[PDB]
Design a binder for this molecule. Structure first.
Ligand code: 5RD
Ligand code: NA
Ligand code: ZN
Length: 257
């Protein structure tokens, strides 16, 4: 029964998920002056040409665009990663106001939203096995700021009316996630966790330096979604973000000078 409200939100999660107070929790604040350039970091390899999107789902916490991950069709490699990570889904976190919504922050700055492209390490065979491993997942995080529209996002925005409430899904084939990327693949990276329960410490975080711009109308449509199921009292799906957690014994590395 976890969520983002006053009575079931991030301050409560530790009671059911004690790893909430663990040693490598996400998100974190990225202090740009303390992050260290790591010249040994390889360029990111984002191979999304054969990506096969299937469906979009309102799961009551966010919406997921799901992909076929039964073959190496859309994969993330390189950077800090060893091996091949398959794209399984992407989703967003966003705010009720343009000045909040991201999970990671940059020098304590909050963006309007944050895109998470979730990948799992193919050496573990399936996603459920991968989340039980310290190097099981790689999540590519991309900040959203409000300004110009992101044309590659509009197909997502267009379909949200059909998945307004928890448990609703719709066909979402032939979507190209490459249209959601910024120009630069410069990034920060650190070892972390899922940012929602069960908060498993299985994620290599790769957070892009360059935000994408989306329009006020695009993010407004995110905010019309519902946490609730159909026929239940309406609760707008907004502020579905976890705040920054203590960095503890971790260093954030930068791919760029
Ligand atoms: C054991 C099954 C866990 C399901 N949990 C999915 C999931 C994926 C990504 C993220 S995030 N927000 O860290 O990218 C959270 C939760
Ligand atoms: Na505008
Ligand atoms: Zn997320």
């Amino acid at each position: 029964h976890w969520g983002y409200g006053k009575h079931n939100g991030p301050e409560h999660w530790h009671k059911d998920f004690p790893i909430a107070k663990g040693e490598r929790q996400s998100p974190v604040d990225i202090d740009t002056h303390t992050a260290k350039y790591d010249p040994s970091l390889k360029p990111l390899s984002v191979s999304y040409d054969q990506a096969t999107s299937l469906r979009i789902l309102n799961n009551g916490h966010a919406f997921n665009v799901e992909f076929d991950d039964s073959q190496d069709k859309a994969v993330l490699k390189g950077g800090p990663l060893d091996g091949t990570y398959r794209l399984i889904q992407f989703h967003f976190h966003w705010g009720s106001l343009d000045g909040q919504g991201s999970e990671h922050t940059v020098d304590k700055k909050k963006y309007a939203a944050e895109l998470h492209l979730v990948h799992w390490n193919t050496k573990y065979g399936d996603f459920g096995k991968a989340v039980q491993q310290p190097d099981g997942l790689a999540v590519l995080g991309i900040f959203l700021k409000v300004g110009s529209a992101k044309p590659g996002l509009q197909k997502v925005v267009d379909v949200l009316d059909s998945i307004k409430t928890k448990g609703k899904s719709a066909d979402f084939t032939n979507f190209d996630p490459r249209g959601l990327l910024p120009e630069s693949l410069d990034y920060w990276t650190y070892p972390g966790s899922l940012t929602t329960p069960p908060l498993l410490e299985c994620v290599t975080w790769i957070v892009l330096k360059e935000p994408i711009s989306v329009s006020s109308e695009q993010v407004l449509k995110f905010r019309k979604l519902n946490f609730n199921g159909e026929g239940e009292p309406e609760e707008l799906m907004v502020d579905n973000w976890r705040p920054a957690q203590p960095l503890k014994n971790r260093q954030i590395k930068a791919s760029f000078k």
